[PDB]
Amino acid sequence: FTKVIDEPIKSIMDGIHDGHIKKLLHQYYGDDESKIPAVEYFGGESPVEDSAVFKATSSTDEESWFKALAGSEINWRHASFLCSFITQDKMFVSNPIRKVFKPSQGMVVEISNGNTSSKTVVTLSEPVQG
Amino acid sequence: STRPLTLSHGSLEHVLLVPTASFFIASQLQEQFNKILPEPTEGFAADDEPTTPAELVGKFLGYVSSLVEPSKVGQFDQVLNLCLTEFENCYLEGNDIHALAAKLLQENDTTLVKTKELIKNYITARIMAKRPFDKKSNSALFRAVGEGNAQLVAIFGGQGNTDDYFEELRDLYQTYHVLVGDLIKFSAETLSELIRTTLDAEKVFTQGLNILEWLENPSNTPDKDYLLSIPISCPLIGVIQLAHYVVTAKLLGFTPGELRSYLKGATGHSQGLVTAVAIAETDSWESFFVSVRKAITVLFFIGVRCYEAYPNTSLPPSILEDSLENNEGVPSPMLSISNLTQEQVQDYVNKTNSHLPAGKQVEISLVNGAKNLVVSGPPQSLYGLNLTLRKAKAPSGLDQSRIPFSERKLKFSNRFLPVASPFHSHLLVPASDLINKDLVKNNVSFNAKDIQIPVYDTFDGSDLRVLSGSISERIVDCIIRLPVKWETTTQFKATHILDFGPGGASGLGVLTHRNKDGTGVRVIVAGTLDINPDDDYGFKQEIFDVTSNGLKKNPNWLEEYHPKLIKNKSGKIFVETKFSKLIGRPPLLVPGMTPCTVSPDFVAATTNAGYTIELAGGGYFSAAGMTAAIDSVVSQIEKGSTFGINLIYVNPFMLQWGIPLIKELRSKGYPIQFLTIGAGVPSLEVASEYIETLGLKYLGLKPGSIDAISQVINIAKAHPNFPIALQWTGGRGGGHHSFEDAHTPMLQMYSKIRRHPNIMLIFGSGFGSADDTYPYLTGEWSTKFDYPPMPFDGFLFGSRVMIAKEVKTSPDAKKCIAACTGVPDDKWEQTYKKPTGGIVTVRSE
Numbered sequence: 021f022t023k024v025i026d027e028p029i030k031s032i033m034d035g036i037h038d039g040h041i042k043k044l045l046h047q048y049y050g051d052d053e054s055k056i057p058a059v060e061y062f063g064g065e066s067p068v069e070d071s072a073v074f075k076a077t078s079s080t081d082e083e084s085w086f087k088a089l090a091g092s093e094i095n096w097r098h099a100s101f102l103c104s105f106i107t108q109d110k111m112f113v114s115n116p117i118r119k120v121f122k123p124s125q126g127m128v129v130e131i132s133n134g135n136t137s138s139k140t141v142v143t144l145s146e147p148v149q150g
Numbered sequence: 151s152t153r154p155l156t157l158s159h160g161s162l163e164h165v166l167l168v169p170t171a172s173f174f175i176a177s178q179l180q181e182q183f184n185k186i187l188p189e190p191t192e193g194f195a196a197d198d199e200p201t202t203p204a205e206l207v208g209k210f211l212g213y214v215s216s217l218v219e220p221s222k223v224g225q226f227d228q229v230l231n232l233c234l235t236e237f238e239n240c241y242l243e244g245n246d247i248h249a250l251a252a253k254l255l256q257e258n259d260t261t262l263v264k265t266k267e268l269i270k271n272y273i274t275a276r277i278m279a280k281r282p283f284d285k286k287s288n289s290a291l292f293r294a295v296g297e298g299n300a301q302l303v304a305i306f307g308g309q310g311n312t313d314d315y316f317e318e319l320r321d322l323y324q325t326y327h328v329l330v331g332d333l334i335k336f337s338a339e340t341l342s343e344l345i346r347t348t349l350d351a352e353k354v355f356t357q358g359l360n361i362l363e364w365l366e367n368p369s370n371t372p373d374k375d376y377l378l379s380i381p382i383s384c385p386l387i388g389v390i391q392l393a394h395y396v397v398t399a400k401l402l403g404f405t406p407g408e409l410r411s412y413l414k415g416a417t418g419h420s421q422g423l424v425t426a427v428a429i430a431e432t433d434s435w436e437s438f439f440v441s442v443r444k445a446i447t448v449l450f451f452i453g454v455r456c457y458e459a460y461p462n463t464s465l466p467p468s469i470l471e472d473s474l475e476n477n478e479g480v481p482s483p484m485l486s487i488s489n490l491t492q493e494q495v496q497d498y499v500n501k502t503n504s505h506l507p508a509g510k511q512v513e514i515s516l517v518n519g520a521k522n523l524v525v526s527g528p529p530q531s532l533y534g535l536n537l538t539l540r541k542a543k544a545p546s547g548l549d550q551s552r553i554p555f556s557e558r559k560l561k562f563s564n565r566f567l568p569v570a571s572p573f574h575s576h577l578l579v580p581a582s583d584l585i586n587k588d589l590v591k592n593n594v595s596f597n598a599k600d601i602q603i604p605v606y607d608t609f610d611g612s613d614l615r616v617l618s619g620s621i622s623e624r625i626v627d628c629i630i631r632l633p634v635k636w637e638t639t640t641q642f643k644a645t646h647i648l649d650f651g652p653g654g655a656s657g658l659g660v661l662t663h664r665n666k667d668g669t670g671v672r673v674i675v676a677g678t679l680d681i682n683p684d685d686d687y688g689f690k691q692e693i694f695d696v697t698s699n700g701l702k703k704n705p706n707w708l709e710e711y712h713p714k715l716i717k718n719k720s721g722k723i724f725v726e727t728k729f730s731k732l733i734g735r736p737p738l739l740v741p742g743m744t745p746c747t748v749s750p751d752f753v754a755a756t757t758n759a760g761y762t763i764e765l766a767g768g769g770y771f772s773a774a775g776m777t778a779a780i781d782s783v784v785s786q787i788e789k790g791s792t793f794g795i796n797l798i799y800v801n802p803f804m805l806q807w808g809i810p811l812i813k814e815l816r817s818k819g820y821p822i823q824f825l826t827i828g829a830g831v832p833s834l835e836v837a838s839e840y841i842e843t844l845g846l847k848y849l850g851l852k853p854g855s856i857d858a859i860s861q862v863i864n865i866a867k868a869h870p871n872f873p874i875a876l877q878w879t880g881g882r883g884g885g886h887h888s889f890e891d892a893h894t895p896m897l898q899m900y901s902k903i904r905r906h907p908n909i910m911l912i913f914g915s916g917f918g919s920a921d922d923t924y925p926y927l928t929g930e931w932s933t934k935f936d937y938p939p940m941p942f943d944g945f946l947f948g949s950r951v952m953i954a955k956e957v958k959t960s961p962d963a964k965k966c967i968a969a970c971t972g973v974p975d976d977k978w979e980q981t982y983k984k985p986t987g988g989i990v991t992v993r994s995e
C-alpha cells in the first residue's frame with residue numbers, strides 16, 4: 021500500500037477515516053448523513069430534570085455525585101463535571117470544577133433550567149457561620 | 151402473645167417468636183434438637199454441623215419434618231408450618247431455595263454438601279407441612295420467555311462425559327427424594343419388568359438392576375466398570391435426565407407440558423435425543439409416566455441389543471501398560487481428539503483404516519466442534535490410531551516461540567472417553583433390526599402430532615416432526631450408526647440453553663458454550679448447583695432466581711462492539727469505537743517508530759492533522775534529549791492537542807530515565823496523553839507503578855504472543871477502571887517482529903480480552919487502506935475462519951506512513967520504500983529465508 025511518495029500525513033489518515041465513514045454510511049445508515057446521531061463534543065468517555073437539588077453526605081459516592089451534577093445531555097455541564105483534565109495554555113491540569121464540587125457533609129447543589137444548556141445555573145451552597 | 155426461642159450452635163444463633171399456645175411443644179423439640187446437634191468447633195469445618203444461621207434453621211426444619219408424618223395430623227404440624235414460615239420471611243427474600251443456597255456458597259465458608267443438605271431440608275419441610283409447590287414462581291427467565299425477551303432450548307447429553315454418572319443419580323435421590331422419589335421408583339419397576347419380559351436380559355445384567363437397593367446402600371452398589379456398561383448406563387442416564395427435568399418443573403410449579411411449552415425446541419447428543427422426544431410428548435403429571443416408560447424402554451433396548459452386538463472383551467495387559475505410561479487413558483471404544491480439524495483427523499483414520507480389515511475399522515462418530523472430534527471403533531484399533539498420533543504431536547511442554555508459525559509442529563490432546571460401547575459406528579448396525587422389533591413388541595411409538603415442540607435430529611439438524619418414516623427408527627439410527635454433527639444440529643436461534651444432561655461442568659452444556667461463545671447465547675447447567683468465577687455459563691440457581699440474576703445474557707460481540715458513526719456540533723463525522731470514544735478523535739494511530747516518529751516535526755504534524763501518534767523514545771539516550779524533543783512537539787501543536795510516548799521494555803537503561811521523566815513532565819501538566827510500552831509487556835508490579843504514578847489517561851501494551859496477551863489481561867483485571875490499549879501486531883509488521891500469525895492468536899484470545907471492558911483492542915501489522923482494515927472494524931474478518939464476528943476498536947499504521955511528506959526519511963529512501971512490491975499475508979513468512987517483496991528478515995545485536 022506504500023506507492024505514492026510525499027503524500028501529506030493528514031491526507032493518508034483522513035483518506036483511511038473517510039474511507040471507513042463512506043463504507044459504514046453505505047452499510048448501516050442507508051447512505052444518509054441525516055441518520056447519524058449528533059453530540060455537542062465527541063470524546064472523554066471512559067470505556068467502562070429541570071430544577072433538581074442534591075444534598076451531599078459522608079457516604080455519597082464521588083462518581084454517582086458527578087454523574088448526577090453533569091446531567092444526561094452532552095453539553096458544557098457534562099464536560100465541566102466529567103472532564104478529568106482542563107487545559108492552561110498548552111498544559112493539562114486537574115479539572116478544578118470537580119475539586120470545588122467534590123462532595124462532603126453540608127454541601128447542597130441546586131440546578132436550575134437543567135434541560136436548557138444555554139440558561140442552566142448550578143449553585144453550590146455550604147454552611148457559612150451557622 | 152409470643153415467647154422468644156433461642157436455637158443456637160456456638161457463635162451462630164437464631165431467635166424464633168413461637169406463640170405461647172404451642173410453646174411447650176417447640177421447647178420439647180429445642181432440647182431434643184440440641185442433643186443430636188454435635189459440639190461447636192472452630193470454623194464449623196466438621197460434617198453434620200451448621201456453618202451459618204440459615205443452615206442451623208434448615209437442620210431444625212429437617213429434624214421437625216423427620217418426626218412429622220403426612221398421612222395423619224400430629225401435634226408437631228403447627229410448629230413445622232410456623233418455623234418454615236420464619237425461614238421464608240428471614241432468608242428467602244421472595245427468591246427460591248437454590249438462590250439462597252448459591253449466595254451462602256460464594257460469601258460464607260459453606261461447602262457444597264452442606265448447601266445440598268440445606269436444600270433437602272427446606273424441600274422436605276415444604277412438602278411434609280402440606281404446602282406443595284402449586285403456585286407458578288416469578289423466575290426471571292420464565293417471565294422473560296412469556297414476554298418474548300428470551301428463547302429457551304433444552305439439550306440432553308449422553309455417554310462419555312463422566313465415569314461416575316451414578317453419583318448424579320444418588321445426589322438427585324438424596325437431595326430431592328420427595329420430588330423425584332416417585333419417578334425413580336417407577337423407572338426401577340419398569341426396568342425390573344423389562345428384564346423378566348425380555349428373553350436373554352438377565353444374562354447381560356449379571357449383578358442385577360435393583361437400582362433402589364444401590365441408592366439406599368452405597369456398599370451394595372456394584373463397581374463403576376459394571377455401572378458404566380451400556381445396558382445399565384443407557385436407561386439410568388435417561389432417568390437422571392428426566393429427574394432433572396421433573397425437579398426443574400416441580401420447583402417452578404409447572405406441569406411437564408407447561409415447561410415443554412416454554413421451550414422453543416429440544417435436542418440431544420447421542421441417547422439424549424430419546425429424552426428430547428420424550429419431554430416433547432408430555433402434557434400432565436398423570437400422563438408423564440407413559441412418556442417416561444417410552445424413553446426408559448427405548449434406552450433399555452438400545453443398551454441391551456448394542457451390548458449383545460459388541461461386548462467389551464479383556465484388553466491385553468501390554469496395551470493397558472503402554473497407554474497408562476504414555477499419559478493417555480484406559481483404551482475405550484471412543485477416542486476424543488481436541489485441537490485438530492475434521493479433515494486432519496479423517497486423514498489419520500484413513501491411514502489407520504487402510505492397514506485394518508472391514509470389521510476392525512474406526513470412523514468419526516461425534517463432531518462436537520470445528521476442532522473437537524471423537525472417533526469410534528474397537529479399542530485395540532483406537533490404540534492403533536493413538537500410536538499414529540503420538541509421533542505426529544509435539545510435547546505439551548515444548549517452546550515453539552522462536553520457530554516461525556507455519557513451520558511449528560501442530561500440538562493437540564487425545565484422551566479415551568469413559569464409555570463401554572462404540573456408539574455411532576458400523577459395529578452396532580446388526581443391533582438396529584433387533585431394536586426396531588423390541589419397540590413394536592412393547593408398544594413404544596413416537597407419533598409426529600403428539601410432539602408439540604421441534605426436536606432437532608443430530609445428523610442434518612432437521613426437525614423429527616417432518617419425518618415421513620418412523621421417528622423411533624430414525625432416533626435409534628441417529629444413536630447407533632449415524633454420526634453426530636453437533637454444530638449442524640445447534641443452528642437454532644436461541645438466547646438460553648438448558649443442559650439437563652449428566653456431568654454438569656464437564657458435560658454437553660459447557661461444550662455447546664465453547665461452540666457458541668460471542669453469539670449472545672447463555673448456557674445454564676440445569677442439573678448441577680455450583681458457582682462459575684468467570685460467569686460465562688450459569689448453574690441450576692439461574693433457572694429459579696426471581697431477581698435480575700435469573701435473566702443474565704451473554705455478550706453478542708457483533709451488537710456490543712458494532713462500529714457506529716457520530717458527528718459533533720461542527721458537523722465533523724467520526725467512527726465511534728470504544729477507543730475513539732475515549733481519545734475524542736478517529737480510532738487510527740501512528741505507533742512509535744525509530745526513527746520515523748523520533749522527529750518532533752512529524753509528531754506535531756500528525757497531532758495537528760488530528761491523529762494519535764507516539765513520540766519514539768528509541769531515538770533518545772538521555773532525559774535532556776527527550777525533554778528538548780517534547781518541548782519542540784508542544785511548541786508546534788495547538789492548545790488542547792496531546793501525543794503519546796513509546797518506550798522499549800528490553801532497554802532497561804532507557805526506562806530508568808524515561809519513566810521518571812514522563813512522571814515529572816505530567817506533574818508540570820505536559821500534554822502526554824499516554825505511554826506505550828514496546829518490545830515485551832511489563833510485570834504486574836511495574837504496570838501498577840506506571841498506571842498509578844505517571845498521571846496518564848491510558849497505557850499502551852504490545853503483546854508479542856498468547857502468554858504476553860494473558861499478561862496484558864492480568865494487568866487490566868488489576869486496574870479495572872483504567873483503560874489499557876492492547877496493540878496486537880502480527881510478526882508481518884515492519885521493524886522488530888514476532889514469529890506469530892496476525893489472526894490465530896486473536897481468534898483464541900478475543901473472547902478473554904472482551905471479558906475486560908477497559909481493554910481497547912487495536913490491530914496492526916499489514917494495513918494501509920480503508921479497504922483492508924474495514925473487515926477488522928465490522929468484525930467480518932473472523933467469519934472466514936468459521937468464528938462469530940469479532941470487531942476491533944482501532945488500527946495502527948506503521949510502514950504505511952514512512953513516505954508521508956512530513957517524515958524525515960530521505961527522498962531516495964522513500965523511492966526505495968515505494969519500489970517494494972510487498973506480498974499478501976500468506977507469503978510474509980518467506981522473509982525468514984530470502985527477499986520476499988523487497989523486504990527480508992535479519993537478526994539484531
Ligand SMILES: Cc1cc2nc3c(=O)[nH]c(=O)nc-3n(C[C@H](O)[C@H](O)[C@H](O)COP(=O)(O)O)c2cc1C
Nearest residue numbers: 741742743744768828879883884885915916948949
Ligand atoms: C520503521 C519502524 C520503526 C519502529 N520502531 C518501533 C519502536 O521504536 N518501538 C515499538 O514498540 N515499535 C516499533 N515499530 C513497530 C510498530 O510500532 C508497529 O508494531 C508496526 O509498525 C506495525 O506494522 P506495519 O509496520 O506492518 O504497519 C516500528 C516499526 C517500523 C516499521
